[PDB]
Structure formats: structure tokens, C-alpha cells
Design a protein around this ligand. Structure first.
Ligand SMILES: *CCS(=O)(=O)N1CCc2cnc(NC3CCOCC3)nc2C1
Length: 345
């Protein structure tokens, strides 16, 4: 077969010249030469079958990426697995190899206003397709945004994605654990389960702030510290925004806080394009109901050199409902993964 950094990687004969890229929990990524298409690809090895939650994420990611077809969304080129359910222990996902990710780029490179503009456009173009399919990404962050050598951007990792459910969004105070901390909308900590499109917009606003300065705008050190950073920049919510928060625990926590003034965007980002700061303000709006939508963000004057609604496609078939798999045993999830991957055999 093939071994990488003390681990089996049975992708051959089609894929050879294996080189380690990175690793996560139960997931390992390698680059490899595709002998059929004569190009280097990215191969992710997943072994989720012992954990029901890992099976959930694997199935969700596979189902979504197989249905989506968009230039700003990473596709699935091939899926490698054993010919039978009994012999299937690992799943290998073959995807286009990208040069870097926005996280790695932001750590060493200053972005020009043109780059920020092109990157934001592509993120919103991809996000318009995702929201049109009634899907929420729920984990938008720089490390989930891949880039090629020509700055073409692709959104990846749909493992935490859900079908939008605005009707069932309300919850209690300090309960929800949606997105990566620094990219978590303020409503997650107050009264939202993160079942509305507005949570993706907040994350995009955080990414834009990070492209402008090369630093996370709200670097909370822990879960409870996140709301302190957001309110430290945005200032105290208005009476109108507090009237939208009916949960007494969340409302009284906000009322207990001393008055804080809004730190102006121009003071935080003195080099930023004024139009980028106007758009940033609209994405990083405290009240989710007043927060700008993906289609409005695309039409903002900051993006006027790229804006073309006829070249910003929507999904052919939206997801009607979410799959009832939070209680499906790992064995039934294994069969579904097996069925979903059969087209690649
Ligand atoms: C969210 C993408 S991933 O982590 O599942 N994954 C699979 C797809 C892919 C494609 N290309 C690359 N390239 C690397 C090169 C080194 O810098 C980071 C990106 N990575 C991935 C990761």
C-alpha cells in the first residue's frame, strides 16, 4: 500500500507520490499525484465509524458536497473506500489541491485593498449559493477558505452545516456552542441556536475585519470572554436591540453591564477603504434582524467592480429539511455513507 507519518493511506494505484499536508481529529490530509488526470490532488483520510457524531459530520459533509456545484465551493473529485460495508474502515476523499488557506496567508502576508475586495466577493458569491440551497455553513473562518496560486477562493468544511430553521432558533442564555469562538455571532451566547443565515454573515464580517488588520477583531480567550470583546467594539446595545431579546436572563445580563461606547471603525482600521468599513459595519451589526443579507452585501458599493447577479448562481435544488440522524445508530450511518459513496466505485 502506502504509509504517511506512521499511518496507512491505501489510495493507490491511481494516486501515488504521497506527501503529508496536515492532520485533525480522526482526519489526515496528504497531497498525491493523480495518474488519470495527471495533476496533484488533496486526499483526506477519515475513520469515523466508531463514533456516532463523527459519522454524522462525515455524512453531512459528503451529502452536501455531492449536491453542490459552484466555483467558490470545494467539490469532491473521487471517494475511495473498500468494496463492501464489512471491509470499510476508512474513507478517502479526493479534492482539488489548493496552494494555501486564508489563515496561513493572514499570518505572513499583508493583503492589498484589491485582494481583500476579490476575496470578499468570492466568499459572498459562494455564500449566496450555500444560503440559496437553505444551508447554513456555521463554521466560516480563515482556515476554511482555500486559495490557489491565482487567488481563486473555495469554501470548505461543511461538517457543522445545517438546514436553516429560523422558527426553531430561540434558546436560553449561555447554552449554544455554534462556530469557532472568534467568529461566533453575539446572539449565540444570548438566545440563538445558530439556525439562521445571519450567523454566517457575522462570521464573514469577522473575516473581513481580519483581512484588513491581519489580527482577529474579537479574540476572546474563552467562551464567556467572547461577548466582552464584541461589546467592547460595538458598544452597549440600544433599547430597540434589547427589546428583541425577550429571554430575561440574557436581557438582564446586558442591562447589568456599564455603558460602553462604540469604537469607530476608522479608528480601528485607519488604512481601510471607507466603503469596506461601511460594509463591515453592516455585517457586524449586533441585532441579527438588522444585519445585512448575502445578496445585499454583494450589491454594496465596495464590491461594484465584481457585482453581476447573472454570474452569482443559486442552487438548483435546495435542502427541504435536515436529516433526523442525531439519534441514528453508527451502524445505520455507516450504510448511508456506503450508499452515498457507491457512485465512485
Ligand atoms: C476545509 C478543507 S480540508 O481541511 O478538508 N482539506 C481538504 C482539501 C484541501 C485542498 N488543498 C489543501 N491545500 C493545503 C496546502 C497547504 O496549505 C493549506 C492548504 N488543503 C486541503 C485541506
Amino acid at each position: 500500500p502506502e504509509m504517511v507519518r506512521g499511518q496507512v493511506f491505501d489510495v493507490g494505484p491511481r494516486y501515488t507520490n504521497l506527501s503529508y499536508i496536515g492532520e485533525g481529529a480522526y482526519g489526515m490530509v496528504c497531497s498525491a499525484y493523480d495518474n488519470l488526470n495527471k495533476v496533484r490532488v488533496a486526499i483526506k483520510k477519515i475513520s469515523p465509524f466508531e463514533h456516532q457524531t463523527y459519522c454524522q459530520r462525515t455524512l453531512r459533509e459528503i451529502k452536501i458536497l455531492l449536491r453542490f456545484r459552484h466555483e467558490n465551493i470545494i467539490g469532491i473529485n473521487d471517494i475511495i473506500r473498500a468494496p463492501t460495508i464489512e471491509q470499510m474502515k476508512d474513507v478517502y476523499i479526493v479534492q482539488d489541491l489548493m496552494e494555501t488557506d486564508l489563515y496561513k496567508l493572514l499570518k505572513t502576508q499583508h493583503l492589498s485593498n484589491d485582494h481583500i475586495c476579490y476575496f470578499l466577493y468570492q466568499i459572498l458569491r459562494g455564500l449566496k449559493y450555500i444560503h440559496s440551497a437553505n444551508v447554513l455553513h456555521r463554521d466560516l473562518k480563515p482556515s476554511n477558505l482555500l486559495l490557489n496560486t491565482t487567488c481563486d477562493l473555495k469554501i470548505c468544511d461543511f461538517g457543522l452545516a445545517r438546514v436553516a430553521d429560523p422558527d426553531h432558533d430561540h434558546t436560553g442564555f449561555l447554552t449554544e456552542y455554534v462556530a469557532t469562538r472568534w467568529y461566533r455571532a453575539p446572539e449565540i451566547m444570548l438566545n440563538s441556536k445558530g439556525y439562521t443565515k445571519s450567523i454566517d454573515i457575522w462570521s464573514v464580517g469577522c473575516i473581513l475585519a481580519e483581512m484588513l488588520s491581519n489580527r482577529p477583531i474579537f479574540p476572546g480567550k474563552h467562551y464567556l470572554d467572547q461577548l466582552n470583546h464584541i461589546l467592547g467594539i460595538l458598544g452597549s446595545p440600544s433599547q430597540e436591540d434589547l427589546n428583541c431579546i425577550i429571554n430575561l436572563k440574557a436581557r438582564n445580563y446586558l442591562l447589568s453591564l456599564p455603558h460602553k461606547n462604540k469604537v469607530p471603525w476608522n479608528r480601528l482600521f485607519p488604512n481601510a477603504d471607507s466603503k469596506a468599513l461601511d460594509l463591515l459595519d453592516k455585517m457586524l451589526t449586533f441585532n441579527p434582524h438588522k444585519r445585512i443579507e448575502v445578496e445585499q452585501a454583494l450589491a454594496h458599493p465596495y464590491l461594484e467592480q465584481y457585482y453581476d447577479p447573472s454570474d452569482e448562481p443559486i442552487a438548483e435544488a435546495p435542502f427541504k429539511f435536515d436529516m433526523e440522524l442525531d439519534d441514528l445508530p453508527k451502524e445505520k450511518l455507516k450504510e448511508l455513507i456506503f450508499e452515498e459513496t457507491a457512485r465512485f466505485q
